[PDB]
Design goal:
This is part of a larger assembly, with chains A, B and C. Chain A contains nine helices and two strands, in the order H-H-H-H-H-H-E-H-H-E-H. Chain A is mainly alpha-helical. In chain A, helix 7 packs across helix 8. Chain C is of the alpha+beta class. Chain C contains four helices and ten strands. In chain C, the strands form three sheets. In chain C, strands 1, 2, 3, 4 and 5 form a five-stranded antiparallel β-sheet that branches. In chain C, strands 6-10 form a two-stranded antiparallel ribbon. The chains are: A mainly alpha, B alpha+beta, C alpha+beta. Chains in contact: A-B, A-C, B-C. It is classed as dna binding protein/dna/rna.
Chain lengths: ~200, ~300, ~200
């Protein structure tokens, strides 16, 4: 009904109401997968405790699935889709309606993590994590901008395309084609703002 | 425009050959080993006890962009002639000569084989000059060259500026470079294009084979001096009518922008007018560069 | 006197060279736990053009082979519908044998190998005190057909390739298998049945 908080240590304890609503919606689909039992009070009541160690737990949830994915590998990683390892955790960032990083704190932590992941895995002769392919709609989300802007950014040569398409065809938004390390670096280099 | 219009090439190398010296003979070729395994595997590396590898090629330059090889239209011809001369007398050939000359002295025509313990480049010409770059590993596209080296760039620029602009001068250069190498360092010659891979060689007059780099592969490196687009110099592109960029799979002067050769070719009447009022803009530099790499400009 | 079981890959986009390497690594790890065992590797889908999308293991001790089959990796890959597994059963008595010898001589086809060989030869001459005077071979060699398997190093920072050839069996002596269940050209004799037969079971 209102916020009214002070000494807001948890990442769920600050902000405008729309964000506070979005954070709960996200928590629910992701951890309350059990079918509705109209436990309208009890089901959501737990979300606050959950977030109290967030700055240090979210990363472990992401780390766990890097390893479980790795041991099930069937192709060299540089032809593997980003989605096969992280399971659309990126798309879920779109459920909070705000676009910028300083307000959408879920996206802010996911990017933090991916930047570190790339940093500890530099390029060498054998491919490794960080060379995964992103689709056009994924870069748009990580770069905090609409899709048409990515097409314009490609056209000017600020980033490379890795898969050669056939002639008399087009690459659709859903096709996986940019390397992760290329997107992370470009964003640090030329996409920052006061937000 | 008109139906027939052509220019021929005004600047060209022959091919590059790799070899080394012995105490017994001055020219021993670097050779390639093949195992039939058809579907083969093959290798090439400097053999034990050879301390340095030599690479050599020749270059001719001709003042051949002053006039259309073929033109079917008297009005198109009158203009193209007036334009080349309007440009020549204001300078600008110096600029093109500076750019071409810089690339020869830098050594980028060695492509993937630049990684040595020290590369020395020596140039001789038909007018009696000799130039010497003691170490080619440190010269950038953009930056001020160290003393005594900046100077030879100016001197070479002058000889070439003439070769490009005045007829009946027969100007040849002979370029040899030395690669100081590693213990058994791998060498990267041109590959064969096929419908596993094979490498390219040439035959010697005595029947031996040698590793080489193709003519146009040397040429593609020399003419890479297009950085006049988007007010952002970066690195230069190989001159192309559409501004193609192979690394990024794109095109910088896509016809959709109005910045390609063919749109620009039709404004010649306006450029001559400006030159007469003259400062040289990027638009006329681009055009002159394309005329030097001549080809077919037809079916208007 | 012989038992086997087979695994097939279900996915059409599976990279055989990458994936096969993991099964061998497991076999090796098992070999380290129980040194006195013998298990051979066979390729029942071997071809001249490719390696094939299946692998099989052959041995003589039924109870031991069952223990191998129970290794967690295989159980996980089946559960997620990546692998199709067979049961352990007796090897048919109506077939012929092959070696599957591996050839390290093929290393000498690549520059990296020649460099290492010479560096050692130079250093080795100091003991003799003679000047280093190497002498090179001629330009042409002929080799047989081989396939590659991608391998990771054991407790180190390296990776490398195994080069596999297929030879027909001829009978003599007594047997032994290498740490990878592979045969060697000399002093490592063993064989496996070429069970390209009855493969309709997976």
């Amino acid at each position: 009904y209102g916020c009214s908080f002070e000494s807001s240590n948890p990442l769920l304890a600050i902000g405008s109401l729309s964000a506070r609503f979005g954070a709960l919606y996200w928590y629910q689909q992701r951890y309350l997968s059990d079918h509705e039992a109209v436990r309208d009070d009890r089901a959501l009541t737990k979300a606050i405790g959950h977030f109290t160690a967030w700055p240090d737990a979210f990363w472990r949830e992401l780390q766990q699935m890097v390893d479980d994915a790795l041991v099930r590998q069937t192709k060299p990683l540089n032809h593997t889709d980003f989605v096969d390892v992280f399971g659309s955790v990126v798309a879920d960032c779109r459920q909070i309606p705000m676009r910028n990083t300083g307000q959408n704190f879920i996206l802010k932590n996911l990017i933090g993590f991916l930047t570190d992941l790339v940093a500890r895995h530099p390029q060498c002769r054998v491919a490794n994590v960080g060379d995964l392919l992103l689709s056009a709609v994924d870069a748009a989300t990580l770069l905090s901008t609409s899709v048409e802007q990515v097409r314009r950014l490609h056209h000017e040569g600020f980033l490379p395309l890795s898969i050669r398409p056939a002639s008399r065809n087009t690459v659709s938004p859903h096709r996986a084609v940019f390397h992760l390390r290329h997107v992370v670096e470009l964003r640090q280099a030329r996409m920052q703002s006061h937000h | 425009l008109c139906t027939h219009l052509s220019y021929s090439r005004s600047l060209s190398p022959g091919k590059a050959v790799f070899f080394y010296k012995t105490a017994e003979s001055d020219f021993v070729p670097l050779r390639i080993e093949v195992a039939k395994i058809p579907q083969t595997i093959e290798a090439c590396y400097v053999p034990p006890n050879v301390d340095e590898l030599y690479c050599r090629f020749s270059l001719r330059v001709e003042a051949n962009s002053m006039r259309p090889y073929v033109c079917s239209n008297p009005d198109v011809l009158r203009v193209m002639i007036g334009l080349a001369q309007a440009y020549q007398r204001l300078g600008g050939y110096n600029e093109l000569a500076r750019r071409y000359s810089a690339n020869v002295l830098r050594g980028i025509w060695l492509w993937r084989n630049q990684y040595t313990q020290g590369t020395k480049i020596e140039i001789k010409t038909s007018l009696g000059s000799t130039y010497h770059i003691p170490d080619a590993r440190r010269l950038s596209w953009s930056g001020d060259w160290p003393e005594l080296e900046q100077k030879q760039l100016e001197q070479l620029t002058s000889e070439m500026a003439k070769a490009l602009s005045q007829p009946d001068i027969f100007w040849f250069a002979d370029v040899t470079a030395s690669l100081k190498t590693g213990f058994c360092q791998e060498i990267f010659p041109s590959q064969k294009f096929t419908e596993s891979r094979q490498l390219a060689t040439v035959e010697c007059s005595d029947g031996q084979l040698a590793a080489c780099i193709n003519p146009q592969k040397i040429g593609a490196a020399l003419q890479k001096i297009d950085d006049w687009w988007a007010n952002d110099a970066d690195l230069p592109l190989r001159v192309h009518e559409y501004g193609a960029n192979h690394e990024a799979l794109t095109a910088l002067r896509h016809p959709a922008t109005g910045q390609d050769f063919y749109h620009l070719l039709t404004k010649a009447e306006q450029f001559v007018t400006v030159l007469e009022s003259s400062e040289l803009p990027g638009e006329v530099h681009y055009l002159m560069a394309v005329l030097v790499k001549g080809g077919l400009f037809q079916k208007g | 006197n012989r038992y086997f079981f087979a695994i097939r890959y279900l996915s059409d986009d599976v990279d055989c060279g990458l994936l096969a390497g993991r099964c061998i690594s497991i076999l090796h790890g098992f070999r380290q736990a129980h040194p006195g065992i013998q298990i051979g590797v066979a390729f029942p889908e071997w071809s001249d053009r490719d390696l094939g999308r299946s692998i099989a293991f052959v041995s003589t001790n039924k109870s031991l082979l069952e223990r191998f089959r129970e290794r967690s990796y295989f159980q996980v890959m089946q559960a997620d519908n990546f692998f199709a597994l067979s049961l352990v059963l007796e090897v048919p008595d109506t077939c012929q044998n092959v070696r599957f010898i591996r050839n390290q001589n093929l290393a000498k086809l690549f520059v990296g190998e020649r460099r290492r060989r010479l560096a050692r030869a130079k250093r080795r001459a100091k003991a003799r005190g003679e000047a280093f005077q190497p002498h090179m071979p001629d330009e042409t060699k002929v080799v047989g057909v081989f396939h590659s398997v991608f391998m990771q190093s054991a407790s180190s920072g390296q990776s490398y390739i195994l080069h596999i050839q297929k030879h027909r069996y001829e009978r003599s002596e007594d047997s032994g298998y290498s740490s990878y269940g592979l045969a060697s050209n000399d002093l490592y004799t063993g064989y496996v049945p070429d069970l390209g037969a009855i493969f309709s079971t997976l």
